[model samples]
Target chain A: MRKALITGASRGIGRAIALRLAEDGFALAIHYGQNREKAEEVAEEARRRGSPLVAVLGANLLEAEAATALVHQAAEVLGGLDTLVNNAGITRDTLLVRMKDEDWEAVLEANLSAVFRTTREAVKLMMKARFGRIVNITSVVGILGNPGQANYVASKAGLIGFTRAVAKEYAQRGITVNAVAPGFIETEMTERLPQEVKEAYLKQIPAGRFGRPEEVAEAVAFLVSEKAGYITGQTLCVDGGLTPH
Target chain B: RKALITGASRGIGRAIALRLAEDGFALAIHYGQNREKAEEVAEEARRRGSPLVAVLGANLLEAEAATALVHQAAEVLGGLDTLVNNAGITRDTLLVRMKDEDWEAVLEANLSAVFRTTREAVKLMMKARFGRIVNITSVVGILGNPANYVASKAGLIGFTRAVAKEYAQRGITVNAVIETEMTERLPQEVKEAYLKQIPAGRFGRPEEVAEAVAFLVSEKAGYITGQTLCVDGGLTP
Candidate 1:
C-alpha cells in the first residue's frame, strides 16, 4: 500500500484530507501544531476506516528546521512515502496599514516559508522514488488580492510561483508539484461568520455559496492520482468562479 | 466538432486550419484572399469526415467587415461556438521607424478585430450559454515583442480579459494563447533568433498551436477563464 503525509492535519481542510486520503488507501502521518488530541482524533478515524496504522507529528511549521524535519520524520515512519501535501499554514490577517511585521513574518513563515523548507527536503526523496505528487493548498486571495489579508494573499501567490519553479526543476524527474487554490470554503471560520459579513462575502461569489472542503479535497486527490501526471506547475483554482475576475 | 478558423488561406492560418480539421474539428475556413487555396483547405477538411466546409472571404482589418464576417460565418455554419482569431500580420519595424498606418493596421487586424468579431457573436453565444474565444498571440506579446507586436498583443491581453470577465457568468470563456513556432510565415531570421530563446530547444509546430486551442475550447477547460496560457516551452512568463 502507498503512503501520504499531510501537514496541518489537525482540523478544517487538513483533518478532512486526512480522512479522505486514508479512505483512498494511504497510511497517513497527521501533523498538527499544538492540538495533539485533534491530531489523534484524525489518526483514530483513519485507522477505524481500515487505513494502515496512523501516526502523528507535531511541529510549529514556522521554524525552518522543524518544517524540514517533519518530512524526514514522516518518511521514516511510513517506510516509504508517495505523496506529500504541504497544507500546514496559519493566517495572520490584518489590513496592510495595521499589519505588524510579526504578522507578516508569522504567516509567511508557516504558510510560505515552510513550503520552501519542506519542499527542499522532500524533493530529494520524491526524486529518488522517481514518482511523487506534491499538492499545495492555496487560496483565491492569492491570485486576486483581497483588502485586509495581504500577507496571506502574498504567501499563496508566492506558492504558485514556487509551484512553477519546482515543476521546471523536476519535469524530467517523474514528479509533479501542483497547487489547488480554493475560494471561500465551508470551514469553521466561514461557518462562524456573522450575518452581515456573510452577506458581504456572498455578493462576490458567483457560486452564491461557500465551497465545501470535500470539493477541494477531490481536486487535490485528483492531482495526486496517476491520471494528473501530464499537468504540472499549474494552479488548479477550485473556487466556484470567485477569482475568475 | 466544427471550428471556424480565420485567415485560413495562408501561413499560420492555413496550417492551423489543416491541423484542426485533421484533429476532428470540422472546418469553417475564412480567408482574406487566395480563394483557390481556401477551397483546397475546405476540400481537405471534407476528406477528414466533415460534411460541411464553407469559405467566407473578408478583410478583418476593417472594423465593419470584422463585425459582418461573424454573421456571414454563422450563415455558413448555422451556428458558431469556437472562434480562433489566428489571422494576424506583423509589421516588424522598431517603434521609431513605425508609421501610423503600420501601427493602426497591426492593431486593427490583429487585436481590435478580435474584439469586433467577439462582440458581434456575444448575443448568440449568450443565448446558447456556451462559447470559447482563443486569441492566438505571439511569444513576443508576453515578453514585449519587436515593439509593435508587443503593443498589439498586450492590448489583446487586456481586451481578452475584459471579454472573459464580462462573459464568464454566461459560460463564455475567452483566453489567449502564445505561439512561438517557426512557421512559413514568420521570417527565418526571426525564427532562428527565437529558437535560441525557447527553452524547448526548437520552434513550435503549427499543430502544437492547434492542440492548445482545441484543449482550451474543449469541455474539460470549462473552469479556466481569462488566462493567458503561454505555449513557448516555458520561455515567457
Candidate 2:
C-alpha cells in the first residue's frame, strides 16, 4: 500500500487533502500542530473511508527539529513514505512597512522554513525508495503578490523557487515536487472577511465565486497520482480564474 | 477517440497532432494557410488506422473561422474528445513600437480565437460527458514579454480556468501548457542568454510539450482542471 503524510490535516485545505488521499487508497499520517480533536475525527473518517490505516501526529512545525522529527515519525508509523504533502502553513498579514521582524521571521519559519525541513527529511527516505510525490500547498498570492501580505507572499513565493530547485535535483530518482496555489477559498481566514469585501473580491474572480477546499484537494490528488509522473516543479492554481500568472 | 488540434501545419501544433494520433485518437488537423503541411499530418494520422483523419483549413484571424472549424471537425470526426488550441502567432515588438493592428491581430488569433473554439468544444463535450481542452500558451505569458503578446497569452490562461470551472462537473478538463522552446531560431548570444535562465540548462523539445498535453488529456488527468502547467524546463517555477 502507498503511505502518505499530510501536514496541518486537522482543518481546511489540509483536512480535505488528507481525506481525498485516503479515498485514493493511501494509508495516511495526518499531521496537526494544535487541536488533536479535529485531527482525530479526520483520522477516524479516513479509516472508515478505506484508508488502510490513518495515524494522527501533532508537532510544532516552526522548530526545525520538530519538523524533521514529524516526518521521520510518520514514515516509521506508516512503514514507508511514498508521498509527502506539505500543507502546514501560517499567515501574518500586514504591509511591508508595518510588518514586524518577528512577523516576517515567524511566517517564514512556519510556512516556508518548516516546509523545507520536513521535505528535506522526507526526500531522503523517498530517494531510497526511488519514488515520491511532494505537493506543497502554496497560494495565488505567491505568484501574483497582493497588498498587505508581504511576509506571507515572500514565504509562499520562496516556496515556489525552492520547489523548482528540488525538482531539478530529484527528477532522476522518480521524485516530483509540485505546488498547488489556491485562490481565496472559503477558509476561516476568508470567512472572517466583511461581506462588502467578499463581494468586491468576487468581482475580480472570473468564476464569480470562491473555490471550495475540495477543488484544491482534487488538484493535489491528480498531482500525486501515478498518471502525473512526468510533471515536476509545476504550480497548479485552483483559483476561480483569479490570476493567469 | 477524436482529437482536433488547431494550427497543426507546423511547430508545436503539428507535434501534438502526431502525438495524439499515436495514442489512438482520430485526428482533425486544423491549419491556417498551410494546407500542404496539415495534409501531411493527416496522412500520417490516417496511417495509424483510426476511422478518420481530416485536414481542415481556416484563417483563425476572422471571428467566424474558429466556430466553423470546430463544428466542421467535430462533424467529420463523428465527435470531438479533445481540442488543442495551439494555433498562435507572434507580433513581437516592444509596446511603444507595437501598432494597433499588431495588438488586435495577436489578441484575435491567440486569445479570442481560442475562446470561440473552446466554447464550441465545451458544448459538444458537455453532451458526451467528457472532454479535454489544452491551451498552448507560453512562458513569456507568465514571466512577461512585450505588452501585446503577454496580454493575449495571459488572457488565454485566465480563459482556460474559467472554462475549466464552468465545465468541471461535466467530466471536462481544461488546462494550459506554457512552453519556452523558441531557442533554435535565435542568434548564438541570444540563445546563451535564454539558456542561462532555464534551470534544466537546455531548451524544451516540442515532444516534451506534447507529452505534457498527452498527460493532461489522458484518463489520469480527469480530476485536474482550471490549471496552467509550464513545460519550460523549470523556467516559470
Candidate 3:
C-alpha cells in the first residue's frame, strides 16, 4: 500500500491531513515531535478505518540524522515511499533588529533546513524507486512581506526557492518538487492571532475570510496526483488573490 | 511631474494623455501624423490647469524618430517621472496571410519602440534611480494573439519581463498593464459581440486603464517587482 508519513501529525492541520490521507486509502505513518497521546489517537483512528497506520517518534528533526531516519524508516516499513509532505513548520515572529539569534536559527532549522535535509534523503530513496512527489507547504507571508515576521518570511521564501531548484534539478530523475503556499488557514497557530490582527489580515484579502485546512489539502492532493505530472517547479498560491502583487 | 505618453494624439494614447494631465501631470504629448488633433489634445491639457503642456511630434515606427521623441519630450518637460508606452497599430491578418512589412510595422511600433525608449530613458533615470515604466501589452499577448497581432504584443510582454527583471533591484518597477477593448474604440455591433465575452458585462473604460497605470507609478507600490498584473476585471481566465 502507498503511505504518507506526516510530521507534526498530532493535532491541528497535521492531524487533519492524517485523517484525510487515511480516509483516501494511504496506510498512514503519523509522526509527532511531542504529544505522544494525540499521535496515538490519530493512528488508532486510521487503524480502525483498516489502514496499517504506524506511529513514529522523532522529536529531534533539527538534527540531520533524525530527519534522514524518519523518511528511511517510513519507506522501509511501507515497502516504499511515493510521496513526502514537508508540512511541518514553526513561526518565530519578531522585529528583525530585536529578534534573538536562537529564535531565527531555530525557526530556519525547523521550517526551512528540515525540508532541504529531508528532501536530500527522500530524493535518494525516490531516485532508487524512480518515482516521488515532495509537496512543501509554504505561506503567503513568505511571498508578501509582513512587519514582525522577518525570520518566518525568510524561512518560507527559502523553501519556495528550494522547491523550484529541486523541481529543475530532479525532473529527469522522475521526481517533482512543488510548493502549495496557503493563506491564513484555520490552524492552531493562526487561531491564536489576535482578533484585531486577524481582522487586519482579512482586510488585505479579497476573499474576506480565513481558509479551511481542507482547501489546502485538496490542493496538495491534486499536485501529487497523476493529473499534475506535467506541472513542476511552480508555486501554486491557494490564497484567494491575496498575493496578487 | 509630468507624464510622457507616446502616440498621444488619438485613440487609447489620446485617452491616457488626457487622464494623466487631468491627474496633475504636466503633459508632454507625443504625435506621429495627427498634428491637428494633436494640437486639440495640447489645448485640452492646458485647459485642465496644465498650461505648461507641450507637443513633441515623431514617428514611432522609425527607430531614430522614436529615440529622438523620448529625448525631446524629457528635455521640454524639464524631466519625466512616468512613462506610458501606449503606441500601437494593428495590420490585422492571419499568420499565413501576414506580410514582412506588416510584421516590421507591428514590432517596430509596439515592441521594439518600448526597448528603444526604455533604454534611452533608463540611461537618464539611472541617475535619478527612481522611476515607473509601464509597457502597454495586451490580453491577447498572454493568451496568444489571433495571428501576427499575437506575435507583436506577446513579444512586448517578453521585453517587459526582461526589463523588469533587470531593473527590479535598481529602484524601478516595470510592469505590463493589459487592457481590453474600451467602449469608445469599438463599433456598436462588434462591441456587442465582445461585451458578451467580458465577465464584467461591459467594455472597459480608458480612464480605468489610466488609473491603474497611475497607481503602479506611485510611491506606495515600491515593493512590487518582476510581476505581470492583469487588470482585465477577472476576464483573463
Candidate 4:
C-alpha cells in the first residue's frame, strides 16, 4: 500500500490533496502546524473516502526539531512513507525597506528550512525503500515576484532549487521530486481580500477567475503517481496561463 | 558615470569592469580574496579611459562585510549609479552526501550577500533618484545541481524582481542576467552532449555576457526592469 505524509493538511490546498489521494486508495498521515480540530475533520473525511489508514499529526515546524520528528512520526504511524508533500508555509508581506529582520527570519525558517529538515529525514526513509515521490508546494509569486513579498518569494524560490537538486540526486534510487506553483487560488484568505484587489488579480490571470483548491490538488496528485516517474525536477504551474513558461 | 562590479578580478566580472571603464565610467572593482588580480583590473580600467578606479576587497560571507563594501565603493567613486552583483560560489554534491556547512556557505555567499549589498546600494540610489542594478544568476537555476547553488541563484532572481518593483518609481531598475561558463574545460563527450541541447550550438563567452551587461546598464535599456536576460545563447529559451 502507498503511504503518504502531507504537511499543512488541515485546510485549503493541503486538505484537498489529502482527500484526493485518499480517494486514489492511498493511506495518509495528515499533518497540521496548528488547528488539530480541523485536521481531525480532514482525517475523518479521508477515512470515509476509503483510505485504509489515516493518522492526524501535529507539529509547529518552526521549532528546529519539530519537522524532523514529524516525518519520523508519520513513518512510524503509516508503516513507511513513499510520498511527501511540503505544503506548510507562512507569509510576511512588506516592502524591502520596511521588512523587519524577524519577519524575514521567521518566514525563511518556517518555509524553506523546515522543508529542508523534513525532506532530509523523509529521503532517508525513501532511500531505504528504494522508491518515493516528493512534491514541494511553491508559489507563482516565487517565479514572478510580487512587490511586497521578498521574504516569501525567496523561501519559495529556494524550495524550487531544493526540489531539482534532490530529484537529480535520487533519480537512480527510484525517487522523483518536483514543485507545484499555484497562482491566485480561491481560499478563505483570498476571499477576505477587498473586491478591488480581487479584480486586480483577475486582470492578470488569463482565465479571468481564481483557481479552485481542487485544481491545485489535481496537479499534486499527478506528480506523486507512478505514471509521473519520468517527470522530475520540474515545476508544474497551475496559474491559468498567468506565467507561461 | 560611476559603477561598482563585484567579483571583478576575473572571468565575466573582469570583462564587465573593462567594458564599463571603456564607456568612461569611474569604477569600483570588488574582489573576494584576490587583491592583486583586482588591482590589475583597476590599472587596465584606468588605461581604458576610466578617470578614477578603486579596488576593494571583502569577504561576502559576512553580512556586515557585504554591506560595508557597498558603502566603501560609494564613498570612493563619489556616488554609485550602477551596481553589479556577480560574486558567487558553488559546492557541487548530491543532497545525500552534502554537508551543512557547504549548503550554508553557498547560500550565504551567493544569495544573502547579494541581498546585503543591494539593500545598501538602493538606499544610496533612492536619494539620487537614478540607478541600475544587475544580478548575475545562472541558467543552472532554471534548467538544472548542487541544491544549495541552484537555490541561491534562483532566490536571487526572485529577490531581483521584488527589488525592481519596490524601486521602479524612484528611477532605479533591477534586472538579472543568466549565464553558463567554463565550457572549454569540459570533456569532449560532455561538451558534445551540452552543445546538442543549446540551439546556438556553441558555448557562451564571458565577453558576450559582458556586452549584455553593458546594454542593460546603458540608458537605452531604461524601460526594461524586473526581467531576466539569458546570455546562454538561447539554451533556456
Candidate 5:
C-alpha cells in the first residue's frame, strides 16, 4: 500500500487531488484545516474509489507545530508516507496601500511558511525511505501578479522559489519537489465573482474557458507519479494557455 | 532628468549609472557598503556629462533603509523621475540546510526592499506626473535555482507587474529586465558550462544590459509598460 498525505484535502483542488490519488490505488491521509465532516465525506468517497486505506486528519497550518504534527500523524496512520502535497493557502485581497500588516503576515505564514515547515518534516521521513514525491500548489497570479493581491502573490511566488530549492537539495536523497500553478480554475470562490470580472479573466486566457478543478488535479497527478521522477524543481502550469512560459 | 540607481557601486549597476549620465541625467548612485567604489562611479558619471552626481549608501537589509534611501535621493536630486532597483544578494545553499537568517536576509534585500523603494519613488513621481521605473531581475527567477535568490528575483517580477497596472494611468511605467551575468571570476569549468548553454555563444556584457535599461527609460519605450526584456544572450528567450 503506497501511502500519501495531502493538506487542505477537505475541498477544492485538494479534494480533487485526494480522489484522483485514491483512484490510482494509493492509501491516503486527508488533512483539513477545519470542517472534519467534509473531510470525512471525502475519505468515504476515496475508499469507495478503491483506496485501500483512508484516514481523515485536521490541523490548522497557521500554527507553527500544526504542519509538523499533521505530517507525523499521517505517517503513523498510513504506516509510512511516499507522497506529500502542500495545498492549503489563503487570500487577503486588498490593494497594497490599504493592505494591513496582519493580512500580509497571515497570508505569508499560511501559504509560504507552512510549506517550509511541512516540507522540512516530510523530507526527514522521505530521506530514510529513499523515495518521495512532493507537490506544492501555487497560483498563476504568483507569476503575473494581480491588483488587490500583493500579499497573496508574494507568498505564492516565494513558494515557487522554495520548490526549486528543496528539489535540488533532496534529489540525491531520492525525493522530488515540484509545483503546480493553477490559472483561473473554477471553484466556489471564483464562481462568486461578478460576471464582468469573469469576462476580464477570460480575455487573458486563450483557452476561452475556466479550468475544472479536475484538470489541475490531472497535472498534479502526473507530477507526483512514477513517470515524473525525472521532473523536479519545475512548475507545471494548468492555466489553459494563460501563461505560455 | 534626474534618476536613482541602486547597487551603483559596481557591476551592472555601475554600467547603468554611467550610461544614464552620458544621456545628461543628474544621477544619485546608491550603494550598499562600498562608498569608495560608489564615489569613483559618481566621478566617472560627472566626466560622462551628468550635471550633478550624488553618491548615497544604504544597507537594504535593514528594515527602514530602502524607504530612507529613496527620500534622501529625492531630496538630493531636487526631484526624482527614474529608479533602477538593481541591488541584490545571494546565499547559495540547498533548501533543507538553508538557515532562516539566509532566507529572511535575501528576501529583505532583494524583494521587500524593492517594494519599499518603488512605493516611495512612485509617490514622489505621481506629484510630477512623469516616472520611469526598471527592476533588475534574473533568468534564474524563471528557470529555477539556489532557492533563496530565485524566490526574491521572481517575487520582484510579480511586484513589477502589479505596480505597473496600478500606476499606468498616473503617467508612470514599470518594467523589469532579466539577465544572467557571467563574471570573469567564475571558475573556468563553470564558465565553459554556461557558454555552451547560451545561444549567442558568449556571456552578455554589463554594457549590453545598460543599453536595455537606457532604452526602457527613454520616451521611445513609452508604450512598453509591464513588460520584461531578457538580456541573457537568448538563454531564456
Candidate 6:
C-alpha cells in the first residue's frame, strides 16, 4: 500500500484532504495538533473504507522536535511514507508595524519552519523509497499581497519558494513537490466572516463566489495522483481565476 | 466587435482569427509578408461566420510600421475594439554569438511593435471605453528561452501587465497567452526532452491556444487582467 501522512487533518481543508485521500485508497497517517476526536473520526472512516493502515497521530507542530518526530512515527507505522501533505497552518494576522515578535515567530514556527522540518524528515524516507509526492497548502495571499497579514503571508510565500527548490532537487529521483493555493474556500474561518466582507470578496472573484473545501481537496488529490507525476514545482490555484497568472 | 490580429498568415494567429470570427468578431487580418496565407485565413474566417475580414500586410520590423498598420486597420474596420499581437520572429543564437542585427530585428518586430500597436489602440479604445488586448507569448518568456526570443516575449508579458493595470478601470483588459507550437518541428530526441518538461506529456494545439484567447476576450473574463495564462500543457508549471 502507498502510505501517506497529512498534517493538521483534524478539520477544515486538512480534514477534507484526509477524506479525499482515503477515498483515493491510500493508507493515511492523519496528524493533528489538537481535536483528537475529529482525527479519530477521519481514521475511522478510512478504516471503514478499507484503507490498509489508518493511523491517528497527534503532535505540536510548532516545535521542531514534534514536527520531525511526527514524520518519523508516520513513516515507521506505515513502513515508510510515499506521500506527505504539509496542510497544517496558523494565522497571526496584523499590520507589520503592529505585529508583535511572538506573533511573527509563532506563525513562522508553526507554518513555515515546521513544514520545512517535516519535509526534511519525509524527504529522507522518500529518497530511500525512491518515489514520493509532496503537496504544500499555500494561499493566494502569498502571490497577491493582502493587507494586515504580514506574518501569515511571509510564511506561505516562503513555503512556495521551498516547494520549488525541493521540487527541483528531487525531480530526478521521482519525487514531486507542489503547492495548492486556495482562495476564499468555505470553512469555519471564512464562514465566520461578516456577510458584507464575504460579498465584497465575491465581487472581486471572477467566479462570483467562494470556493468549496472539496474543490481544494480535488486539486491536491490530482497533484498526488499518478496522473500528476510530472507536475512538480508548480502552484496550482483553486482560486477560480482570482489570480490568473 | 472589430479585432486586428497581427501575423494572421499562419499558425496560432490564423487559428485565433478563425475563432474570433466564430465568436462574431469582425477581424482585420494583418500579415507581414504572406499575402496568400493571410487570404486563406480570411476566407476560412468568413466561412466560419459573417463577421467582416479585412486583410492588411506590413513589415512590422520597421520603426513606424506598427503605428501605421494600426491606423490603417482601424480606418478599414471603422473602429478597433480588440488587438491580438501574435506576430513574432526568432533570431536564434547564443547571447555571445548573437549579432546586433539579430537582437535589433527581434526587438523591433516583436516587442516594440506590440508597444506601438497597443499605444495606438489605447487611444481609440479609451475613447470608446472598451477593449481586449491578448498578446501571444511563449513558454520561453515565462520559463526562459534563448537570448533574443526570451527577451522579446518577456518584454511583451511585462508590457501586457503594465497596460492591463493602466486601462483596467477603463473597461479595457490586457493579458498574455504563453504557448509554444515549435515542438512539431523539433527532432525526436529534442522533442522527447520538451515532452518531459510538460506535465501533460505533449505540446499544445493551435486551436487550444485559440480557445484561451477567446475566453480572455469574452465577457466572462472581465476580472482577469494583468495576467499571463500558460497554454503550454503544463510545461511551465
The interface RMSD values of the models, given in order, are 4.7, 4.6, 14.8, 1.7, 2.2, 6.6
What does DockQ come to for candidate 3?
Answer: 0.02
| Cα shift from native, residue A158, model 3 (Å) | 0.5
- lDDT by residue (B106-208, candidate 3, tens digit) is 8788888878988887777667887778887777876773666678777777776677656655666676762344445667787677666544344455656
* lDDT of candidate 5 at residue A187, scale 0 to 100: 87
DockQ, per-model, please?
0.10, 0.20, 0.02, 0.52, 0.39, 0.09
- Candidate 1 lDDT at B159 equals 81
Pick the lDDT winner: 4
Question: If ranked by TM-score, best first, what sequence of candidates would result?
Answer: 4, 5, 2, 1, 6, 3
TM-score of 5: 0.87
Work out the TM-score per prediction.
0.70, 0.71, 0.54, 0.90, 0.87, 0.61
Residue B206, candidate 1: Cα error in Å is 4.7
lDDT scores for all predictions? 0.77, 0.84, 0.73, 0.88, 0.86, 0.83
Candidate 6 clashing pairs? none
- Candidate 2: clashing pairs of residues: none
Question: Which should have the higher lDDT, number 1 or number 2?
Answer: 2
Q: Which is superior by DockQ, 4 or 5?
A: 4
TM-score of chain B of 4: 0.95
- Candidate 6: deviation at residue B17, Å? 21
Compute the lDDT for candidate 2: 0.84
Off by over 4 Å in 4: B178-203
Q: Could you give the CAPRI-style class of model 2?
A: incorrect
Better of 3 and 6 by TM-score: 6
Error of 3 at B147 (Å): 10
**Preferred candidate (DockQ higher): 1 or 3:** 1
Candidate 4 residue pairs in backbone clash: none
* C-alpha lDDT of residue B96 in model 3: 88
RMSD of each: 6.0, 5.9, 16.9, 2.7, 3.2, 8.3
Residue pairs that clash (backbone atoms under 3 angstroms), model 3: none
Error of 4 at A20 (Å): 2.2
